[PDB]
Amino acid sequence: TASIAQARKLVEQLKMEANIDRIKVSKAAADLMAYCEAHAKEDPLLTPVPASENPFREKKF
Amino acid sequence: MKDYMILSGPQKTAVAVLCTLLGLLSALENVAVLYLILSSHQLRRKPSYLFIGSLAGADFLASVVFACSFVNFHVFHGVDSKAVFLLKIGSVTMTFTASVGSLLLTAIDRYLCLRYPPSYKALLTRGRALVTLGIMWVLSALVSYLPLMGWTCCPRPCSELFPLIPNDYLLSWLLFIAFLFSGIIYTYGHVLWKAHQHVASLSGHQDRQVPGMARMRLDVRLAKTLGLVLAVLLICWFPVLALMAHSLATTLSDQVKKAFAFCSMLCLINSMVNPVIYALRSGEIRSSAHHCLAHWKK
Amino acid sequence: QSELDQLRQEAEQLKNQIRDARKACADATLSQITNNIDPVGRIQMRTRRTLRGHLAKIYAMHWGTDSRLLVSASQDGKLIIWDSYTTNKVHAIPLRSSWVMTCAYAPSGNYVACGGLDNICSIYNLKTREGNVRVSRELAGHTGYLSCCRFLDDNQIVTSSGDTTCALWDIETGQQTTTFTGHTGDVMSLSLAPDTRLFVSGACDASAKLWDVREGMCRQTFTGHESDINAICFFPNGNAFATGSDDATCRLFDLRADQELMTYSHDNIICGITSVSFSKSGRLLLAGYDDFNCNVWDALKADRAGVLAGHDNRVSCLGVTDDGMAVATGSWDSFLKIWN
Amino acid sequence: VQLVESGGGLVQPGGSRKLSCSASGFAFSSFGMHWVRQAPEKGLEWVAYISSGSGTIYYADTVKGRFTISRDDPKNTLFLQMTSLRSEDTAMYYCVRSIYYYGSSPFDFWGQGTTLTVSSSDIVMTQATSSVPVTPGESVSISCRSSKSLLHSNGNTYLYWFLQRPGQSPQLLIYRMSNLASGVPDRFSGSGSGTAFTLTISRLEAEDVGVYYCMQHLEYPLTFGAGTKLEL
Amino acid sequence: GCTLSAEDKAAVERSKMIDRNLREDGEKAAREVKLLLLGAGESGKNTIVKQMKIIHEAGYSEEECKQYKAVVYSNTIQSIIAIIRAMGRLKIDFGDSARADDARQLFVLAGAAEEGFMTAELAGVIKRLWKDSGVQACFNRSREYQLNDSAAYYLNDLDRIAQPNYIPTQQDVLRTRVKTTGIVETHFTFKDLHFKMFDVGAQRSERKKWIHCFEGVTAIIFCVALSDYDLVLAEDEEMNRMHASMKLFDSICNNKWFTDTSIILFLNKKDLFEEKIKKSPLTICYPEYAGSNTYEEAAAYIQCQFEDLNKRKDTKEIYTHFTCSTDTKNVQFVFDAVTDVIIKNNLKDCGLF
Ligand SMILES: Cc1c(C(=O)c2cccc3ccccc23)c2cccc3c2n1[C@H](CN1CCOCC1)CO3
Ligand SMILES: CC(C)CCC[C@@H](C)[C@H]1CC[C@H]2[C@@H]3CC=C4C[C@@H](O)CC[C@]4(C)[C@H]3CC[C@]12C
Ligand SMILES: CC(C)CCC[C@@H](C)[C@H]1CC[C@H]2[C@@H]3CC=C4C[C@@H](O)CC[C@]4(C)[C@H]3CC[C@]12C
Ligand SMILES: CC(C)CCC[C@@H](C)[C@H]1CC[C@H]2[C@@H]3CC=C4C[C@@H](O)CC[C@]4(C)[C@H]3CC[C@]12C
Ligand SMILES: CC(C)CCC[C@@H](C)[C@H]1CC[C@H]2[C@@H]3CC=C4C[C@@H](O)CC[C@]4(C)[C@H]3CC[C@]12C
Ligand SMILES: CCCCCCCCCCCCCCCC(=O)O
Ligand SMILES: CCCCCCCCCCCCCCCC(=O)O
Ligand SMILES: CCCCCCCCCCCCCCCC(=O)O
Ligand SMILES: CCCCCCCCCCCCCCCC(=O)O
């Protein structure tokens, strides 16, 4: 009875997850590319900022 | 120096070639073990291997300074001013005194290891090890360069064993190094005694323990290791100090000085033996040596 | 004896149907589309601070919203709140159970949480009337070990315990409002979306599930790993997430496409992943591989971009700041290096 | 949060006196403690400071050497022993908490103020205004002029705004002239850039009247302001 | 010096004070032994913890008593906030004598705001609310939904809590200990050693992850009762719990994280083993399992069966022992064995081995 209810809950979860509207991988990939390109300016890890706009700097002692 | 310098052909060949070979191989082994210890930052973090590295550096400096001094005194019979000559003798004395002091620091390290074993990690800190190592080096340099700055044996008679060295300071340095060796003997004696007491206390509670396991106990292995190290130390430092005490007693012929030269060659043999045994007994040093040989081959 | 078998066959048919759907919508992969973008090849980041004061090994860290304070949890009992810009400590909270595996930092900066092996989430108040840090709440409604704690607000915390379920708590009440229970293995990691509406969770059965905190139902389920999942981090757009595993394969799953996009696997790695973080743009992929050093993948071409070496042991957790200024790695050599 | 200090009130000049401040309600063992004089019908002024764990002690320029100070942690008490008192030390003394970290609010709590009467370079904070009559319910602007650029390299300008009610103790209400203290309502704002700072009150109430002080905390000694009062 | 300011220097001074207390606590944690305790469910670890940790031997620490009474006040605040929430989230409305009760709720929030010490007027208003008989009878209805099990002890002693004088007992911390979720830290002192036994228990199903945090440890106590060959603890046809213990010791002793940490293995029930081997021989189990019919050699053979499960490792030694009903012998053996482990690890750190 416990395994039957567990399998029923699992197959209801699979049936609920099956009825989700998909999308083309190309369109979502283009959206992710557009986000990554439009936010590439404010990324100090691929464009290393100078010491003026960098709170992490060398300490003398 | 006519009575100090001994001129003999087979001596001038054989003792020079032997000193050059022993000093060169000791310097190579010391540079190898110093690079092996200082290459790994985890070995630098460990204070016991830091003491072993200080031993290796003192032994390297002993090898190079003793080799250069012995060659310059015997092979070419070079004559120098009293200032730089006493500086050279004091440098040799500083290297050997720092070597004996580093063995004493290693002994006290093992005594704290077997005296308060859980407290050993907190008490003997890397910083405290650096502090006591600096104190040992400064004390060795002070007691060694004392005759350079302090005094010269012009009014009193000088011991024939060492050129331009006063007799009373020779007695004082012999008493100091004898106190160091007596501390080493006392320390390793208490280490072996506490190890025997611990193994006996562990074995006494369980009756079936010693038939149950055929593994050799740590008491026998520790006794063999410390007995080998201390036996090499005693047998290779006893004739040098014994001839120093005999020179304190009376002045005998130049063949005794030749025998002291061969005993100092034996001291250099112990100098090259020491980093070999203090490296090969350490399994982490052996593993790092195999890793460095694999790195050098690749 | 037969009804269970035919429900299992119906579940297998539904899994085959969703697999055929995600295969049918898979006409163009991401690696084929990203052959025209300019690749970044030389990403050299230097360590700027090496935080010191941890006796034992680090297990977690979390940056603040101000990008200046970072929490860190270890086994020595003291959970330390570091100040990044000037290396000095701000608080050292004495923990009750020192066997902690996670920590967090509230988006308001007020509270700080930590789970552990004691199956309890201790939430501490920092900005209090006194100067010490008192135990504010102790959420003890779990059975398995806690793996990741996340703060939504000063009222709602989501925890990933080891009893194959996640929770959603109200802090001052003390009881769990929502229980997210579809996982079969031990739930290992959480990742919140930037709008705090839905979170993904990674268990030991290689299933990364997207849960919704409003209803409490498993919205999505992803399975593409051979081994167990150790870490997840959302993309900054909130429509994708990277996921680490012990099979040496970061995988970037997609939400609208409902499948994996790329696989950040090299050939000379037989080592596990422990933590995964993204930069502000999401171009980089900070992956804490447990071969004693971190790695920087390119999240559009799967190319390596930089090795962050300098740790004597496994890197346990790394985090990118909320503005993108630096990334801090905390490893098992008790160090907190701040790579910039 | 309770600070009760005691000692003095009728002291012959030239004699010593030891003042004890009991600290109940908080972690006293990790609080640097400051002292503040208040002369009759005059403004506040700093005395001394003890760091956490008595590591670093600071004194003012005019009371250096004559005073000594100590901290007893297991009783949570602070002792100020004053030797060779001058005729200008007749004041009300405040012993105040202070904790120093990022986002901290030091000087946040004030003692009740003990009374001690006797029988008979510096960053000068030139507050031009000293009394502004205003009705309740309008925006009130108090200016504070400094003698040194308080904008440090790390970005935070070390000036604090303090409220003192008539017949009460002073109270911190704004720290670092941007942030508000934990307990003040959101009416008080701070503006300005380095040279001159401005306290703006949106609407004034019956509890918002009193004397306003501005403190620089860039360098010791902590020279306070004159104190602009608000009457209705 | 140029970058530093007054508050920056004070923050560095606080950081030095913090790092100092951190290092003091670190060297206090390095002067103490932490050791793991795995055991089978048939074996029984509770009796080992009770014989090793005597209540009379180790009293409650006075320094943590303030933290303990703070936990007591926090549980009292949690109890009364649960009461006022139950009177706020009540499905069927109940008439209240005081309309200010909800404001009293806020007042219980206000005491929740500070939480410095016990507020006397808060205790008074909670006593006035508890004076209503409906508030007292509401607890039985509150037992229905999810509620604290150790709540009636605090909610019935509200007048006793209201007194400022308080009594610390081991029953008081047992009220928090009764939840028994997670690992249990049992702390006992012996011969200037602070042993900390961590028994993980059967709370967690899978241990592929959370064993990796136990890399830094000194010993591994492994208590197995050798009377389990006839006893039954079986989720399948594998009735012999001894094979389960063999697989457990094979998974732990040969684990990659435990390659340098030894295992102190305790044979727990030897008197019951003696009675059940005099009653029936071990030949029924397996032929090769039965080395000899006698008690002693079989008692050797079982521990020999644990000696050869260590796959070729010589840097870790199984310190086997037979558990008897004596507090002195077991604690003394743990002391000597952990001391031997610490001596071997520190000599390996020195390099003398
Ligand atoms: C000089 C010397 C040793 C030599 O054989 C030696 C080496 C090189 C050149 C020489 C030239 C002529 C003569 C001897 C040498 C030697 C050999 C072993 C141990 C030594 C030691 N010393 C030192 C003498 N001390 C000086 C300070 O006061 C106490 C004793 C220190 O201990
Ligand atoms: C010479 C090198 C190895 C440094 C040696 C340092 C030794 C001599 C010093 C430094 C720290 C000292 C220990 C400090 C604290 C204690 C605890 C006390 O209850 C007994 C003495 C004892 C155990 C001291 C013994 C001596 C000690 C270990
Ligand atoms: C210096 C004085 C006070 C103490 C000396 C203690 C040491 C040096 C002596 C005393 C007892 C000796 C031990 C006596 C018995 C044995 C067993 C034998 O099979 C190996 C050697 C061994 C282990 C000896 C080693 C050296 C020993 C430990
Ligand atoms: C240990 C061995 C292998 C190497 C060291 C040998 C030493 C111990 C031997 C070799 C030469 C020996 C010396 C040879 C000659 C004499 C002269 C005699 O009237 C007194 C003893 C004395 C001074 C001997 C003392 C011991 C001695 C120095
Ligand atoms: C490797 C080490 C042990 C080698 C040591 C060699 C020593 C012990 C040998 C080699 C040369 C030997 C010396 C050779 C010549 C003489 C002259 C003779 O009238 C007295 C003995 C004496 C002085 C010998 C003493 C012993 C001696 C010094
Ligand atoms: C009889 C012994 C005399 C020792 C003379 C000084 C030798 C060096 C001592 C180093 C001390 C290092 C710091 C120890 C601090 C402590 O007391 O615990
Ligand atoms: C006054 C000196 C007292 C100590 C004298 C003895 C010093 C230690 C000697 C150890 C000898 C060990 C021999 C081991 C032999 C073996 O392998 O079984
Ligand atoms: C490592 C072995 C140590 C051996 C020590 C040998 C003994 C040295 C003692 C020197 C004392 C000499 C006193 C001589 C006095 C005199 O001139 O009559
Ligand atoms: C005439 C007497 C000569 C005596 C020569 C003694 C030479 C001692 C050599 C010691 C070798 C030690 C080898 C270490 C082996 C290891 O543990 O790895």
CA–CA gap between residue C304 and residue C49 (Å, rounded): 24
* CA B110 – ligand 1 centroid, Å: 30
The β-bridge relationship of strands D170-175 and D159-164 is antiparallel
Structure tokens belonging to residue A60: 């003398």
Best probe of the E interface among D1, D24, D52, by most E CBs < 10 A, is D52
* Residue B156, burial from CB neighbour count under 10 angstroms (0-12, 13-18, 19+): exposed
Nearest CA in chain D to E15: D101
Distance from C-alpha of B242 to C-alpha of B235, rounded to nearest angstrom? 11
- Residue B269 alpha carbon to ligand 7 centre in Å: 23
**Chain A interface includes C145 (CB < 8 A):** no
One-letter amino acid at D77 equals T
Class of domain D120-226: mainly beta
Q: How many CB atoms lie within 10 A of CB E65?
A: 14
| Pocket lining: B281 vs ligand 9, CB cutoff 6 Å | yes
Q: What phi and psi values does residue E6 have, to the nearest 5 degrees?
A: -65, -50
Partner-chain contact E10 D51, CB within 8 Å? yes
The span from the CA of C328 to the CA of C62, in Å, is 9
The DSSP annotation for E253-302 comes to HT-STTSSS--EEEE--HHHHHHHHHHS-TTTT-TTT-S-SSHHHHHHHH
Long-range pairs for B126-135: beta carbons < 8 A, 24 or more residues apart: B126/B45, B126/B46, B126/B47, B126/B50, B128/B47, B129/B47, B129/B50, B129/B51, B130/B50, B132/B105, B133/B50, B133/B51, B133/B54, B133/B105
Q: Which residues of B95-105 are buried (b: 16+ CB within 10 A; e: fewer)?
A: bbbbbbbbbbb
Determined by: cryo-EM
Which residue's structure tokens are 């920087």?
C296
DSSP assignment of chain B: -TTT----HHHHHHHHHHHHHHHHHHHHHHHHHHHHHHHSHHHHH-HHHHHHHHHHHHHHHHHHHHHHHHHHHHTS-----HHHHHHHHHHHHHHHHHHHHHHHHHHHHHHHHHHSTTTHHHHS-HHHHHHHHHHHHHHHHHHHHHHHHS---SSSPBPTTSTT-BHHHHHHHHHHHHHHHHHHHHHHHHHHHHHHHHHHHHHHH-SSHHHH--SPPHHHHHHHHHHHHHHHHHHHHHHHHHHHHHHHH----HHHHHHHHHHHHHHHHHHHHHHHHHHHT-HHHHHHHHHHHHHHH-
Runs of H (alpha helix) within E216-260: 241-253
Count of CB atoms within 10 A of residue D23's CB?
A: 26
Q: In what order do the strands lie in the sheet with D10-11?
A: D10-11, D114-118, D91-96, D33-38, D44-50, D57-59
Say whether E177 is catalytic: yes
What letter would DSSP give residue D161? E
| B284/E333 touch (CB, cutoff 8 Å), yes or no | no
C-alpha span between B87 and B90 (Å, rounded): 5
Residue where the block lists tokens 């699979």:
A14
Instruction: Report the length, in residues, of chain C.
Output: 340
CA dist B182 and B256 (Å) reads: 26
Distance from the alpha carbon of residue B161 to the mean position of ligand 5, in angstroms: 16
Gap between the Cα atoms of B182 and E215, Å rounded: 41
CB C147 within 8 A of CB C161: yes
> Which chain C residues contact residue D97 at CB under 8 A?
131
Has E47 been annotated as catalytic?
yes
Q: Which residues line ligand 6 (CB under 6 A)?
A: B 128, 131-132, 135
CB C317 within 8 A of CB C275: yes
Reduce the DSSP state of residue E187 to 3 states and report it.
strand
Ligand 5, atom 3, residue with closest C-alpha: B266
Cβ E32 vs Cβ E196: under 8 Å: yes
A21 phi, psi to nearest 5 deg: -65, 120
User: Tokens 């205004």 identify what position?
Assistant: D129
Contacting residues of D for C131, CB less than 8 Å apart: 26-27, 30-31, 97, 99
Judge: D153–E3 Cβ closer than 8 Å, yes or no. yes
Q: Are strands C121-125 and C135-139 parallel, antiparallel or unpaired?
A: antiparallel
Q: What is the resolution of this structure in A?
A: 3.2
Query: CB–CB of E209 and C204 under 8 A?
Result: yes
C14 — phi, psi (to 5°)?
-70, -35
Cα B100 from Cα B2, distance rounded (Å):
32
Q: Give me the sign of the Cα torsion angle B21, B27, B33, B35.
A: negative
**Burial per residue of B204-233, b for 16 or more beta-carbon CB atoms within 10 angstroms, e otherwise:** eebeeeeeebeeebbbeebeeebeebbeeb
Report the DSSP beta bridge partners of residue D118: D11
> CA of E106, closest CA in chain D: separation in Å?
17
Distance between CA E245 and CA E224 in Å, rounded? 7
Taking the Cβ of residue C90 and every Cβ of chain A, the question of whether any pair is shorter than 8 Å is answered with no
Domains and CATH numbers, chain A: 1-61 (4.10.260.10)
Nearest atom in ligand 1 to the alpha carbon of residue B144 is 27
Look up residue C123 and give its two tokens.
């939430």
Question: Cβ of A20 and C17 within 8 Å?
Answer: no
* Contact of B244 with B170, CB cutoff 8 Å: yes
Q: Which domains does chain C have, with CATH numbers?
A: 1-340 (2.130.10.10)
CA of E235 to the centre of ligand 8 (A): 78
Secondary structure letter of residue C127 according to DSSP:
S
CA dihedral (E124, E129, E131, E136) positive or negative: negative
| Domains of chain B as residue ranges with CATH | 1-298 (1.20.1070.10)
Residue whose structure tokens are 């001994």: B6
Contact D93, D113 (CB under 8 A): yes
- HEC string for E289-335: CCCCCCHHHHHHHHHHHHHCCCCCCCCCCCEEEECCCCHHHHHHHHH
Question: Using only C-alpha atoms, what is the Rg of chain D?
Answer: 18
Q: Is the CB of B181 under 6 A from ligand 8?
A: yes
d(CA C165, CA C207): 12
Rama region for D155: left / alpha / beta (φ>0; ψ in -120 to 50; rest): left
Domain with CATH 2.60.40.10 in chain D: 120-226
